[PDB]
Amino acid sequence: ARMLAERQAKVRALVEAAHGLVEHQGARAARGEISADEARRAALEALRALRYDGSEYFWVNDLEPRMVMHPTNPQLDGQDLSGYRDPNGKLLFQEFVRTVRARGSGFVDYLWPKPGSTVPVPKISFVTQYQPWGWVVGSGLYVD
Ligand SMILES: [Zn+2]
C-alpha cells in the first residue's frame, strides 16, 4: 500500500501552514506596524518553537543558500550551504533554491538525519518560498 502520497500531503499541508505564518508577519511589516526585522524575528521564533506529529520540524534557509534557522541542527545557522552535500553527493539546499526559484514550491528528496541522531536517512521534504525576504521554508517526512 502506498499510502505515502497521504504523508506527503500532510507535510505539504504543514509547510503551507508555515508559509501562512510567514506571509502573515510579512504583511504586518508591509502595512508598517512592525519593522521588517521584527516581522522576521517573530516568524523565526514561531518556526523554531513549533513541532508537529511529535518531532517533525521546519527550517528556513535563504537563496544564497545560507541557513537562517535550523532547529535540530542549529550549528548550521548562518553557514553557507552552497556545496553542502548529503552522503550521496546531493547539493540538497542548492536543489531547494532551484526548485522554489523555478517552480515556486515542490518536493525534494535527499538524505538527512532524524532529530537526535547523526546518520542521514531517506527524507522527502516540501519546500516553499517567501520572496520578499528571499526565504525558503521547508519540512520533510522520513520515508522509513
Ligand atoms: Zn493575526
Author numbering: 38 to 181
Quote the paper.
Binding of a small molecule or other stimulus to these domains initiates a response in the cytoplasmic domains, which in turn triggers the downstream regulatory processes. We have undertaken a study of the periplasmic sensor domains from A. dehalogenans 2CP-C with an eventual goal of delineating the functions of some of the signal transduction proteins (The term “signal transduction proteins” hereafter is used to refer to transmembrane sensor histidine kinases [HK] and methyl-accepting chemotaxis [MCP] proteins only) from this organism. Although sensor domains have been studied for many years, there are still many unknowns about the actual ligands that stimulate a given response and the mechanism of signal transduction. It is now apparent that both HK and MCP proteins interchangeably use the PAS-like (including tandem PAS-like) and helical bundle sensor domain tertiary folds.
Periplasmic sensor domain (residues 38–190) of chemotaxis protein, Adeh_3718 was isolated, purified, and crystallized as described in the methods section. Adeh_3718 crystallized in space group P3121 and diffracted X-rays to 2 Å resolution. Salt bridges are observed between the carboxylate group of acetate ion and side chains of Lys160 and His107. Two additional hydrogen bonds are made with the side chains of Tyr94 and Tyr147. The methyl group of the acetate is facing a hydrophobic pocket lined with the side chains of Leu129, Phe130, and Phe133. Although PAS-like domains can bind ligands nonspecifically and acetate binding by Adeh_3718 sensor may just be a crystallization artifact, one cannot rule out the possibility that Adeh_3718, which is a chemotaxis protein, could be involved in sensing environmental acetate by A. dehalogenans.
